[PDB]
Structure formats: structure tokens, C-alpha cells
Swiss-Prot record:
Post-translational modification (record): Sumoylated in response to retinoic acid binding, sumoylation is critical for dissociation from ER and subsequent nuclear translocation.
Name recorded for this polypeptide: Cellular retinoic acid-binding protein 2
Biological source species: Homo sapiens (Human)
Linked residues for Glycyl lysine isopeptide (Lys-Gly) (interchain with G-Cter in SUMO): K101
Function: Transports retinoic acid to the nucleus. Regulates the access of retinoic acid to the nuclear retinoic acid receptors.
Induction: By retinoic acid.
């Protein structure tokens, strides 16, 4: 797979609901949903090594990881976690997360390149799943 690109969002589902499961209050959800409606996403992939930068007006994250090697990031709601990404399949990576401190819903994410050339991000918190779809700019 080649996940490299500058990716533009074309669909979001259940993001507000995901934030509600994670305990984000309604005013903060409103801020977040609006900002997340127009993100800039940069991915660079070199084999199993990845750089992903996701930028919005209210939050930007930058992660560097190798598939198969633990790394530290934050959950979508901003809590430090340890993460490990695996290939579920040739074109789909899955990341399990464990909080560094405290308790909360079980969180994960997936990124997949679909047969039509798009990118699907999913983010999960307990049983609630957020689906976001992107195409390169
Ligand atoms: C949740 C949350 C916030 C904003 C989070 C944002 C904006 C996340 C965007 C995610 C994207 C942009 C995902 C993607 O597309 O990969 C703010 C800072 C208001 C503080 C309250 C907790």
C-alpha cells in the first residue's frame, strides 16, 4: 500500500457521538466537530514506517511510528496512551491503545486504503465507531 499523500476529507460519521462516549462536554464537542470538518492531513509512508500529521484550527497532532513497534500518542480526546499498529490486511492497519494513566473507554483506530483509492479512518470508543473518508487533494 501507499498511504502517502495530502488527504482531504469527504465524509465524517459519528464523530460527535464518539466524543460524547469519551466524556467531552457539549460546548467542547461543538468546537471540535467544527474544527474537524476541515482538517489537513499529511501522511508519509516508507515501507512500514509512517509519519501522520493531522491539523485543525484547534488541535494538531503529529505521530511517527513503525508497524509492529509500540509508540506513544494521545487518544482522540487528548489523553496520553501507548499504541501499537498492526497490518490487519495488506491495505488496512489497526491500532490498539492503552492509557498511560487512569481509566476510560477502550479506544482504537484503523486506516485503510480502499479499492477506489480513498482512505478510511475509523476511531472507536467502546462500541461507538466514527468513520471518516478522505481522498488525496
Ligand atoms: C476532542 C477535543 C478537542 C478537539 C479535537 C479535534 C479537533 C480532533 C480532530 C480529529 C481529526 C481531525 C481526526 C482526523 O480526521 O483524523 C478540543 C481541542 C476542542 C478539546 C476537547 C477535546
Amino acid at each position: 500500500p501507499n498511504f502517502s499523500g495530502n488527504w482531504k476529507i469527504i465524509r465524517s460519521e459519528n464523530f460527535e457521538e464518539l466524543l460524547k462516549v469519551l466524556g467531552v462536554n457539549v460546548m467542547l464537542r461543538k468546537i471540535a466537530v467544527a474544527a474537524a470538518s476541515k482538517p489537513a492531513v499529511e501522511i508519509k509512508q516508507e515501507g512500514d514506517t509512517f509519519y501522520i500529521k493531522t491539523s485543525t484550527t484547534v488541535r494538531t497532532t503529529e505521530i511517527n511510528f513503525k508497524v509492529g513497534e509500540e509508540f506513544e500518542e494521545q487518544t482522540v480526546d487528548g489523553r496520553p496512551c501507548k499504541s501499537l499498529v498492526k497490518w490487519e490486511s495488506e491495505n488496512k492497519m489497526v491500532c490498539e491503545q492503552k492509557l498511560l494513566k487512569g481509566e476510560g473507554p477502550k479506544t482504537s483506530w484503523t486506516r485503510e486504503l480502499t479499492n477506489d483509492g480513498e482512505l478510511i479512518l475509523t476511531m472507536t470508543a467502546d462500541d461507538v465507531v466514527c468513520t471518516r473518508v478522505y481522498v488525496r487533494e
